[PDB]
């Protein structure tokens, strides 16, 4: 009824410990969601074309051209680690767990409140808020996954991360097909390159409507909506990282000399002349058996063209890479292609007392050593005469195509049947949790945005919309906008996310890396004297595991 509650607030985390070292992590998240009525009740096909920014030669990477359908519906997205776990929960998980499974997900909407706003004619403005007990909130769950998948973590538009702060749903939109061409250039290119928006291919048009595709529930103040429990079918996610590159695979060489006194410069020596050694190499025209030249089982990682931009029907885009840079852990300034950079607002980690439109940003440097250090690569002639001469070697300091700033490693790909690589680590709190698999016939081996990828399906998207609240002057044949009472809704959202994790075992004599509080990061986890909060980022794959 009007005065009866339809649900309970729960933002607790439960750790039920099953048999055989497994734990059943249940994460409950409850939010107060504020929803305003849409700016228009209509679907808009809008086209963006920043020809002013791209008309500057050399700015082709700043292209924003696209077409999208703008919908009156809003999306309630909880696909971010911060919606479920606070820093203590994350510390427990990443310090005590070895692997993580995604089990089930359910959500519900309860305690719906719809209000109206009326402004007086008094010369000094004043306005009052009234309940509309008969107003309804439209709710649609796309359980069949008919609508385009639009995960909000990409735009930092999921639900907030604080149980005690109200949150909002992101207005919903999806990409409408367009054709675009942009010929790249540089500062000093003669003429204006081709920079044209071509229009839309009729064979690719897809105008989706929530009304025509999803059942819609009308909720009054006494109604509730529950989705039911969806069960995932994803692969396990590892909370451990690999440090072994190809140089650390297999039996090391026997040291026929070992140091007799401890010290930095007291090295051990193999003691066998290099071309007189025993072992296996994949180089049939040399007798040198060295650490660089000895055969290894396979490859760990792969070189890829970095900051390579590829063009298709819709315009340029960056070629994605599955691993981060080498040497970035030692020097953060060297973090580059492959190290994901997140920008976010005050709902999602930025100090809440800060003023200004500038977001908080961090580049996520992962602990796994699967990257490449391109400054250390080189090609050389098949003859393999050592020491190598200038004409028989290609170094990263060597111009490709006549350019002093482009070398061979920029256009270099070594992905092959021998490549081994890991899935992307989880990123707390701004990282996406699960992603839908592409509907291509042949599927990618991994996703760069989520550690969990859904094979068959995973949960439909939850859309909300304040139902139209018309005045007495409505005329559907009028060309002007709809006359509506200023109406908005506040409703409570509760979700349950279930994980299954495996407790870790100490395999080594030494202790491992763990997340801890210290004097430096002490005040990143508590409120300020004026109530400000922040959620800094945390690394996930702390513990090391042996690759081979």
């Amino acid at each position: 009824g009007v005065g009866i509650s339809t649900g309970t607030f729960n933002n607790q985390t439960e750790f039920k410990f099953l048999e055989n070292g497994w734990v059943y992590i249940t994460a409950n998240s409850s939010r107060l969601v504020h929803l305003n009525m849409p700016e228009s009740e209509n679907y808009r096909r809008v086209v963006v074309n920043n020809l002013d920014k791209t008309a500057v030669n050399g700015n082709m990477a700043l292209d924003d051209t696209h077409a999208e359908i703008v919908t009156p519906w809003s999306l309630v997205d909880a696909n971010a680690w911060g919606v479920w776990f606070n820093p203590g929960d994350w510390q427990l998980i990443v310090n005590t767990m070895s692997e993580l499974h995604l089990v089930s997900f359910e959500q519900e909407i309860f305690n719906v409140v719809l209000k109206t706003v009326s402004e007086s004619a008094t010369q000094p403005p004043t306005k009052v808020y009234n309940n509309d007990l008969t107003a309804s909130l439209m709710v649609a769950l796309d359980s069949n996954n008919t609508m385009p998948f639009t995960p909000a973590a990409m735009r930092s538009e999921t639900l907030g991360f604080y149980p005690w702060k109200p949150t909002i749903p992101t207005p919903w939109r999806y990409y409408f097909q367009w054709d675009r061409t942009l010929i790249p250039s540089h500062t000093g290119t003669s003429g204006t390159p081709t920079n044209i928006y071509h229009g839309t291919d009729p064979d690719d048009v897809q105008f989706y409507t929530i009304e025509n595709s999803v059942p819609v529930h009308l909720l009054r103040t006494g109604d509730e909506f529950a989705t039911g429990t969806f069960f995932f079918d994803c692969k396990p996610c590892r909370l451990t990282h690999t440090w072994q590159t190809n140089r650390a695979l297999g039996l090391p060489p026997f040291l026929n000399s070992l140091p007799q006194s401890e010290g930095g410069t007291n090295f051990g020596y193999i003691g066998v002349q290099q071309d007189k050694r025993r072992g296996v190499t994949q180089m049939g025209n040399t007798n040198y058996i060295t650490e660089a030249t000895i055969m290894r089982p396979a490859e760990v990682g792969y070189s890829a063209p970095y900051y390579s931009f590829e063009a298709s029907t819709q315009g340029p885009f960056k070629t994605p890479i599955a691993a981060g840079r080498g040497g970035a852990q030692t020097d953060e300034n060297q973090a580059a292609d492959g190290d994901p950079r997140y920008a976010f607002g005050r709902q999602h980690g930025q100090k809440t007392t800060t003023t200004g439109e500038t977001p908080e940003r961090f580049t996520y440097i992962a602990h796994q050593d699967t990257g490449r250090y391109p400054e250390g690569d080189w090609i050389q002639n098949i003859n393999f005469n050592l020491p190598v001469t200038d004409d028989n070697v290609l170094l990263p300091t060597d111009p490709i195509g006549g350019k002093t700033g482009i070398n061979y490693t920029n256009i270099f790909n070594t992905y092959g049947p021998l490549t081994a690589l890991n899935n992307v680590p989880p990123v707390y709190p701004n990282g996406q949790i699960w992603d839908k698999e592409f509907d291509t016939d042949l599927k990618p081996r991994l996703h760069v945005n989520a550690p969990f990828v859904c094979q068959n399906n995973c949960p439909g998207q939850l859309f909300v919309k304040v139902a139209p609240n018309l005045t007495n002057q409505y005329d559907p044949d009028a060309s002007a906008n709809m006359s509506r009472i200023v109406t908005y809704s506040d409703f409570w959202w509760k979700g349950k996310l279930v994980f299954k994790a495996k407790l870790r075992a100490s395999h080594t004599w030494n202790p491992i890396q763990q997340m801890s509080i210290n004097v430096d990061n002490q005040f990143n986890y508590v409120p300020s004297n004026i109530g400000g909060m922040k959620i800094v980022y945390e690394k996930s794959q702390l513990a090391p595991r042996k690759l081979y």
Partner: antibody
Amino acid sequence: EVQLVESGGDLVKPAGSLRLSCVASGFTFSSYGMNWVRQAPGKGLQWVAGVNSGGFTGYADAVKGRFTISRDNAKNTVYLQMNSLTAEDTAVYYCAKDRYYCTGDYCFNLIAFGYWGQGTLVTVSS
Amino acid sequence: SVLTQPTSVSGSLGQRVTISCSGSTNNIGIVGASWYQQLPGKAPKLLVYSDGNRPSGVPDRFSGSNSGNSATLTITGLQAEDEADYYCQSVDPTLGVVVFGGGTHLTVL
């Protein structure tokens, strides 16, 4: 090779109306826009109007309130309708094709005529 | 919006010729000019695109460039084939109006 042929020239009174037509061939007609550019005797070229695949049109400020242009992709034909003609409209009108593929509402951001017809004469006088 | 061209330009056989077209940030500063050739009484012919490319069969003699709000057409190795009239064409994206220049007559000496 691309080829265009125009028609419809005539002499009309200083306040009459007239209609012109071009026929095209040799390319994907629906993918490229078609334009009407005129040249007064002894003067330079002047743009009149253009129409794209979906029927969207653009008119110069000199003819925006008077003229009308249309297509028929099933017939590879483009028409121009002129109303309330004045003496200044006297010129030879040339029918041309765009180099760039544009179809819908958001054209006229990049235009470059790559093939041309033969032209037809329009004379406005008593 | 209208483009500006010099009335005439003169060059001698074997020399270099330059024709200049001036516009604004609204027309040429975003979409560069495209150059056309018109023999007396004949239909125009495109010579250089806005990006410096030429239609198939156009000699490399013809070239173009864009700087700020002005564009130029350069004819190298002027031959007797080049005695004609030339026009600069640009489109205004703000208004959606195609703009031609006033035209320039080329004299070969």
